[PDB]
Design a binder for this molecule. Structure first.
Ligand code: GTP
Ligand code: GDP
Ligand code: MG
Lengths: 51, 427, 56, 102, 430
């Protein structure tokens, strides 16, 4: 998505580049929340495992 | 499917064009009555460029014949190929030519203009595509120079994109058929500079000289003189009609050879040429072809390139041949005579190869080049025009038609500036 | 000599630099659309509401 | 391309006004190079922040200023024609009546 | 399985198409009609029964070159919709083939490549052929690569192009199109190959013994190089090289990707019986300047990375000895910041001969693709030639009239200068 967004910007096709930036930020928020959960899940386990 | 429409103007264009149609009809194997009786499937690949199809296997050329007096036309009808042309494409007036530029341009040209244009419109809008038009006329006459330039302007207004390639004959400096030539040549040059994309100049003196030097013809008539011109016309369009190793049509030629919009007057030459008794003693090869083409004696225009410098040059080759050998010669002729090329444009020589040679010849080549040597041609006519213009009374033949005397000053001024412009680029 | 310099301006006789043929060849960009193509008469063009009930 | 600060100040002030859309004829012809070059920097700055919408708007302003300038140039060409031919015609206008007088 | 799609542009591209696909069909063994009298699926699709169809698209803007294929012997093998031909050619004009006529046909081709991509389960890259000097090859090829960059993104778009010869030229406007096309290539192309005609003529006469060649003989030399390049994807080998392995190992920087090509042994069928042609012998032949397919001397510059591909009874032990020895010489300079410099690929299938061909039945061969700073020699020549013609504005009127704005001429000139700076900055040492 960000590779194709690069070429859209570089080709001077800016109207379509706006749409992919909208979807790119949306797809980050879903993925950012997940790895926060996984790390917190693992971090909680390790102190329980060590204790 | 890059159709070309053929236009023949005047006594000179009709006689050149008539011989020209004999060459291609032989090349594509077309019988004089119009039916194909050929020998190879290749000839039917793209014959649509010059011929139209009628029911029953008859091909009609995309030609228009233009004249002001019927005398020239009836000669074409009586020819062996007279029945080939479509009768409606014969457009003629019923008045004397007059051998006058103004009378042809203004008096009779206007009446014939609308009749000729609609005939062209029939041919122009009858084919799937149209690359450009083709005009053949003389500059010393009155109909080809007067009416031909008028049609050239109207063609440009309606079809700006198409290539208006013209073949012209320039008045001879020593001996010529007409007295009033300096007026006709100068006034027509104004119209040719701004309108036509490509102009090829041919002088009858070189055709005489080449025939006496090379072909060893003791008494060459206009039949053999016209034959040399028809080969050049056939060679330029050969990339359209036949396949090849490296294709190059008209629009490629215009891009490479024309650096600036006004400098597009060209010289032409054809090789190999050999006496018809000496052909056995000559091993015709690729290096031998370039020897003739860059030899100054094979120019069909009496303007010695050595007195000027080249700007661009192009060569067309026909026949199965080595691409290395063609390219190597183009290196050497550019390198061996570096005193005759401009330094600020490298690789001044263009090349192209076509597969299929003309009949009887295993290989042949054509040359088109642009050089400052044209200054010699325009100096002769301008000096003679200057001598004539001060003797104002010959203008009276042109005033009685409606031509303003300022048009003479306008015509010479632009012609004078073109001479300076071709001179200024020598620095 | 100053008059001579003024006579020959630094263009150096590059006359007719845009010829009639080249002006024919150059591509002309698209023009604004014709009025007839836009045409719709006023009251219908101004309409506000519709018959589809997309509300609740 | 290292445009001088004096040009940059004058151009950007108009660039700010042009980006509001109101001005149509406020373009200084001699300073049109500074305004467009100033828009180039604002185009580059907009791209770096993902503001592709403003980048296209700057592109639209570039073509708008250039296209209208051509029309100002177009009026110059026609003004040349009428002025020049009228003087030339006056030479023929005077000669007509004097031909009758002679 | 694993697949590539071939795209051909221009007269050079189509004529190369016949040269390469003749080799692919003969080497795989498929008849020109699509029957048989394996790796088949990398290059060909099956339609049922026994009929195969090439996975390629031929593009040009004039019908003459394509119709030779349509009327030729191989006419039945290719599928009609793949062969795409325009109306009037670009007339050696970049702007014409990029804005006016290019955009008349660009969207039609993009459907056929994408539709051909539907039959691709494991597509891993494209191959695209140009001629820089031509109009369509540069104008339409630039417009094609720009669209394919956004249509597909992170898929390897390899190129195999003909760089202009150092002196030999067929078009006067050649410097204009080569520079303008370069700007479009660099940002979008994953990797682009250069060969030049002038070197091939010298190689086809000296090493291979022919007094006078044509373009047909040159096309077969390129066909061998491409066949070796893709042999790793098709046949078993001790060391395979996928496309992705090729991309990472060769290019050190984003914009420095430009390699050069060489093939060995190239020797006439008569003299080939005279030598054993060990792995050491053929390896030494590649590194000589005379065998290089690009007429730039490597000794003027330095080597950045190298890749060798072996097709024959070639054993891993004797490869290492040969590459070790060439490292010991001090005529092959390397940038000391690249100590390793090599990737070796080994495949078992020997090179295949062609009837009416010019090469021999050789039992082992080696192909070489390396990046060098000596290619900056080639860019300098083109930059100087463009400067002379543009200083007096020798041909600008043709290009501007066909839609191109004049501001692109200095932008392309400036961008080439940055590329020249990059090559000199890479050549610097610490
Ligand atoms: N090596 C090699 N080069 C070729 C071959 N055919 C054409 N060329 C090169 O192509 C250049 C001319 O451009 P074209 O062949 O016309 O390619 P193009 O992109 O289609 O150009 P246009 O026909 O104007 O559209 C020549 O200078 C040759 O160097 C070929 O078969 N082999
Ligand atoms: N090359 C060539 N020139 C010719 C031929 N016939 C006539 N001419 C020349 O063409 C020139 C002009 O001819 P002209 O009758 O005035 O043609 P016009 O243009 O219709 O007025 C004359 O000087 C003739 O010598 C021919 O068959 N071939
Ligand atoms: Mg082409």
């Amino acid at each position: 998505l960000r590779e194709r967004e690069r070429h859209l910007v570089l080709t001077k096709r800016y109207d379509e580049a706006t749409a992919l930036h909208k979807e790119g930020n949306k797809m980050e928020k879903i993925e950012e929340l997940e790895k926060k959960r996984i790390f917190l899940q693992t971090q909680k386990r390790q102190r329980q495992q060590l204790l | 499917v890059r159709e070309i429409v053929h236009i023949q103007a005047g006594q000179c264009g009709n006689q050149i064009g008539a011989k020209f149609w004999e060459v291609i009809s032989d090349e594509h194997g077309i019988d004089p009555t119009g039916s194909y009786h050929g020998d190879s499937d290749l000839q039917l690949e793209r014959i649509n460029v010059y011929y139209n199809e009628a029911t029953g296997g008859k091909y009609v050329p995309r030609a228009i014949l233009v004249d002001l007096e019927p005398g020239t036309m009836d000669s074409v009808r009586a020819g062996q190929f007279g029945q080939l042309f479509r009768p409606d494409n014969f457009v003629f007036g019923q008045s004397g030519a007059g051998n006058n530029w103004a009378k042809g341009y203004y008096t009779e040209g206007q009446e014939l203009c609308e009749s000729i244009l609609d005939v062209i419109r029939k041919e122009a809008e009858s084919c799937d595509c149209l690359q450009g038009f083709q005009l053949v006329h003389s500059l010393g006459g009155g109909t080809g120079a007067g009416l031909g330039t008028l049609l050239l302007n109207k063609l440009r207004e309606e079809y700006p994109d198409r290539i208006l390639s013209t073949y012209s004959i320039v008045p001879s400096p020593k001996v010529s058929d007409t007295v009033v030539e300096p007026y006709n040549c100068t006034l027509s040059v104004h119209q040719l500079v701004e309108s036509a994309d490509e102009v090829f100049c041919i002088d009858n003196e070189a055709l005489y000289d080449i025939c006496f030097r090379t072909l060893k013809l003791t008494t060459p008539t206009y039949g053999d003189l016209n034959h040399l011109v028809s080969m050049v016309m056939s060679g330029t369009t050969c990339a359209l009609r036949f396949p090849g190793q490296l294709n190059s049509d008209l629009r490629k030629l215009a891009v490479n050879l024309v650096p600036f919009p006004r400098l597009h007057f060209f010289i032409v030459g054809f090789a190999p040429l050999t006496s018809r008794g000496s052909q056995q003693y000559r091993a015709l090869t690729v290096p031998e072809l370039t020897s003739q083409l860059f030899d100054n004696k094979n120019m069909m225009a009496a303007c010695d390139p050595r007195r000027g410098v080249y700007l661009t040059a192009s060569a067309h080759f026909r026949g199965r041949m080595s691409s290395k050998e063609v390219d190597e010669q183009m290196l050497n002729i550019q390198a061996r005579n570096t005193s005759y090329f401009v330094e600020w444009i490298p690789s001044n020589v263009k090349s192209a190869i076509c597969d299929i040679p003309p009949r009887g010849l295993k290989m042949a080549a054509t040359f088109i080049g642009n050089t400052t040597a044209f200054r010699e041609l325009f100096t002769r006519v301008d000096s003679q025009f200057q001598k004539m213009y001060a003797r104002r009374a010959f203008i009276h033949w042109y005033v009685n038609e409606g031509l303003e005397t300022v048009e003479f000053d306008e015509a010479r001024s632009n012609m004078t500036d073109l001479i300076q412009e071709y001179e200024m680029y020598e620095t | 000599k100053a008059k001579a310099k003024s006579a020959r301006r630094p263009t150096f006789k590059k006359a007719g630099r845009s010829t009639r043929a080249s002006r024919g060849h150059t591509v002309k960009p698209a023009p604004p659309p014709s009025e007839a193509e836009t045409f719709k008469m006023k009251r219908f063009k101004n309409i506000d509401h519709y018959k589809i009930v997309d509300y609740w | 391309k290292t445009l001088t600060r004096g040009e940059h100040i004058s151009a950007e002030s108009r660039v700010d006004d042009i980006l509001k859309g109101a001005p149509l004829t406020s373009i200084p012809l001699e300073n049109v190079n500074q305004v467009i070059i100033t828009l180039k920097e604002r185009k580059r700055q907009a791209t770096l922040a993902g503001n592709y919408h403003l980048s296209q708007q700057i592109v639209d302003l570039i073509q708008k200023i250039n296209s209208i300038v051509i029309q100002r140039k177009h009026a110059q060409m026609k003004s040349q024609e009428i002025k020049a031919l009228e003087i030339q015609l006056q030479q023929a206008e005077n000669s007509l009546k004097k031909t009758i007088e002679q | 399985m694993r697949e590539v799609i071939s795209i051909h542009v221009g007269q050079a591209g189509v004529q190369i198409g016949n040269g390469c696909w003749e080799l692919y069909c003969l080497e795989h063994g498929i008849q020109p009609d699509g029957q048989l009298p394996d790796a088949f699926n990398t290059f060909f699709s099956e339609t049922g029964a026994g009929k195969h169809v090439p996975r390629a698209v031929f593009v040009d803007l004039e019908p003459t070159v394509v119709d030779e294929v349509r009327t030729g012997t191989y006419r039945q093998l290719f599928h009609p919709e793949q062969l795409i031909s325009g109306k009037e050619d670009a007339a050696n004009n970049y702007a014409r083939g990029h804005y006016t006529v290019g955009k008349e046909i660009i969207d039609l081709t993009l459907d056929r490549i994408r539709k051909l991509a539907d039959q691709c389960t494991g597509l891993q890259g494209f191959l695209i052929f140009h001629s820089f000097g031509g109009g369509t090859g540069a104008g339409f090829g630039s417009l094609l690569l720009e669209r394919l960059s956004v249509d597909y993104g992170k898929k390897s778009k390899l190129e195999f192009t003909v760089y202009p010869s150092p002196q030999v030229s067929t078009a006067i406007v050649e410097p204009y199109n080569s520079i303008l096309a370069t700007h479009s290539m660099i940002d979008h192309s994953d990797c682009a190959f250069m060969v030049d005609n002038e070197a091939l003529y010298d190689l086809c006469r000296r090493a291979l013994d022919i007094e006078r060649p044509t373009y047909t003989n040159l096309n077969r030399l390129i066909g061998q190089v491409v066949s070796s390049l893709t042999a790793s994807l098709r046949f078993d080998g001790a060391l395979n090289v996928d496309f992705t392995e090729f991309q990472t190992n060769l290019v050190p920087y984003a914009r420095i990707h430009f390699p050069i090509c060489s093939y060995a042994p190239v020797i006439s069928a008569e003299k080939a019986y005279h030598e054993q042609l060990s792995v050491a012998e053929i390896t030494n032949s590649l590194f000589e300047p005379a065998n290089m397919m690009v007429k730039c001397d490597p000794r003027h510059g330095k080597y950045m990375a190298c890749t060798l591909l072996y097709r024959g009874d070639v054993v891993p032990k004797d490869v290492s000895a040969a590459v070790a020895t060439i490292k010991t010489k001090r005529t092959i300079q390397f940038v000391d910041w690249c100590p390793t410099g090599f990737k070796m690929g080994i495949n078992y299938q020997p090179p295949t001969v062609v009837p009416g061909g010019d090469l021999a039945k050789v039992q082992r061969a080696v192909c070489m693709l390396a990046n060098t700073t000596a290619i900056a020699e080639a860019w300098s020549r083109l930059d100087h030639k463009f400067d002379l013609m543009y200083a007096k504005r020798a041909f600008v009127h043709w290009y501007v009239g066909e839609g191109m704005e004049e501001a692109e001429f200095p932008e392309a000139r400036e961008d080439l200068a940055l590329l020249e700076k990059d090559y000199d900055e890479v050549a610097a040492e610490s």
